[PDB]
């Protein structure tokens, strides 16, 4: 009811900000990437969570100026990742020898080359495993804990934080 109209206003301002600064504002992560299989849509969107709406921006400055204009527009706070200064870590690939699970980043097909670093920042070394039983065993069974998600969307990170939904 009321929330639907609110969502319409939010999506129209988001589109308006996208048109306002066309080159810098690439769009939402959905727009610029794709899940490989339909199966993994739920698990990928589950691991990303809040990151579903992260607007790709060139620079912090233009992001801020858009935030100012949005302040005039009375819009919800949004997240901008600037490719120039985004401080990402190289992909720890050493987990590719795990005989049961796979890297989550191995399930996204990205059209633009630059966005791969932001994808690494959003995924890190999160792992997607075949079933819940294996996911629990190889999440908690090592001396070090591992960030591991099962296909039903329960997420356990290396630090021991637990989340779901």
């Amino acid at each position: 009811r009321q929330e639907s109209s609110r969502q319409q206003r939010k999506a129209e301002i988001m589109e308006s900000i996208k048109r306002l600064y066309p080159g810098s504002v690439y769009g939402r992560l959905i727009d610029l990437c794709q899940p490989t299989q339909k199966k993994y849509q739920i698990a990928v969107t589950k691991v990303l969570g809040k990151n579903m709406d992260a607007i790709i921006v060139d620079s912090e400055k233009t992001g801020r100026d858009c935030i100012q204009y949005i302040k005039e527009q009375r819009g919800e706070p949004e997240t901008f990742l600037p490719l120039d200064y985004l401080e990402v870590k190289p992909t720890d690939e050493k987990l590719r020898e795990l005989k049961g699970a796979k890297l989550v980043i191995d399930v996204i097909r990205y059209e633009p080359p630059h966005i791969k670093k932001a994808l690494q920042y959003a995924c890190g070394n999160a792992l997607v495993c075949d079933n819940v039983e294996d996911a629990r065993r190889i999440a908690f069974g090592g001396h070090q804990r591992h960030k591991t998600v099962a296909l039903d969307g329960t997420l356990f990170q290396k630090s021991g934080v637990i989340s779901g939904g």
């Binding site: 120039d84 080359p113 630059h114």
Partner: protein, 358 residues
């Protein structure tokens, strides 16, 4: 990436050491080959952010290099000659990549001399070395190598010529060179890149069409008329070549930015009308020592084979004007007989296939 200034750095080092060691007489085959291969994809985006007059002097240097084989006129000395040829063609690759690769460069970074040089070079080399060795009609690993080289040369040259404006003196030679290959046998790849070249040429400058169309018509006798290699433009379901060439031309000129739509469609129709009138009148009556009737037969059989696809319009336009021209042509009693005979035959065949498709 953003810049990826490490192999940009590599090649920059290569270039400065090379032109320094030359300025203060050949670079050697390896340097030129690597520099060109790095120019293509590595310097697909990296050609920007360099020193301008530096480029001016190096392109002057490779120009003076190339001239060593301009009109080269060609048991070990022969090997040395073919060595000279492959070196100069590698240089040509380098230059034609450097002229085009960037979406933007300063003006006056490429002067017409490199244009004329590569044109006459390719013309002479091709028309005096390639055709004799592949077909005795007019008349080792490097031969097929240079063949591939010239394919890349002419494709890149097509793209560059499409990009910027040029001067008519070059236009005459480039047009003659691009129309030339369609009258020898085993040049399929050359044929289709040349198709691209001629249609770009036909696109840009709207004043040489009469000359290019007549110079197409001139060499109709020398056409292949061989079962093997007749239909070599894939799409089973092969079609002839010169018909593809003419249709591509006639469809090309639309110039879409009001009155533009009208005048463009009129320009297309007028060109087609002229082409078909010239063809039919020169074809019909039996002349001395030569006929055209099989040629027209193959043209129309191709047309009927290609009546309705998404990516070949104007064929129905050709058919409509053809029909009206035929019927308004053989009605009256002023022409001779055999022309009426041939026209009525062609109309019968095309009507038959039309009804059959129906």
């Amino acid at each position: 990436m953003m810049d990826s200034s490490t192999f940009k750095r590599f090649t920059a080092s290569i270039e400065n050491i090379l032109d320094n060691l030359e300025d203060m007489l050949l670079l050697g085959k390896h340097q030129l080959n690597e520099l060109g291969s790095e120019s293509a994809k590595i310097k697909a985006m990296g050609i920007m952010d360099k020193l301008s007059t530096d480029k001016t002097v190096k392109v002057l240097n490779i120009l003076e290099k190339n001239i060593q084989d301009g009109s080269k006129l060609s048991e070990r000395l022969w090997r040395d000659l073919i060595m000279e040829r492959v070196t100069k063609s590698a240089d040509a690759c380098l230059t034609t990549i450097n002229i085009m690769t960037s979406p933007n460069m300063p003006k006056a970074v490429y002067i017409e001399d490199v244009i004329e040089r590569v044109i006459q070079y390719t013309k002479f080399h091709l028309q005096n070395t390639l055709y004799p060795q592949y077909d005795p009609v007019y008349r080792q690993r490097v031969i097929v190598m240079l063949y591939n080289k010239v394919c890349d040369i002419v494709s890149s040259l097509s793209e560059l010529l499409e990009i910027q404006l040029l001067t008519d003196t070059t236009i005459l030679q480039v047009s003659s060179m691009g129309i030339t290959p369609f009258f020898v046998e085993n040049v399929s790849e050359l044929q289709l890149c040349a198709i691209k070249l001629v249609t770009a040429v036909f696109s840009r400058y709207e004043k040489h069409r009469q000359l290019i169309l007549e110079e197409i018509f001139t060499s109709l006798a020398r056409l292949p008329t061989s079962k093997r290699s007749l239909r070599n433009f894939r799409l089973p379901m092969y079609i002839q070549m010169v018909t593809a060439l003419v249709l591509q031309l006639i469809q090309c000129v639309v110039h879409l930015p009001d009155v533009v739509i009208t005048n463009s469609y009129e320009t297309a129709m007028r060109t087609a009308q002229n082409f078909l009138s010239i063809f039919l009148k020169k074809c019909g009556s039996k002349q001395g020592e030569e006929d055209y009737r099989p040629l027209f037969e193959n043209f129309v059989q191709d047309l009927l084979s290609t009546v309705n696809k998404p990516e070949w319009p104007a064929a129905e336009l050709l058919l409509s004007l053809l029909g009206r021209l035929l019927v308004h042509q053989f009605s009256n009693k002023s022409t001779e007989m055999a022309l009426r005979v041939a026209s009525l035959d062609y109309l019968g065949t095309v009507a038959a296939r039309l009804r059959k498709d129906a």
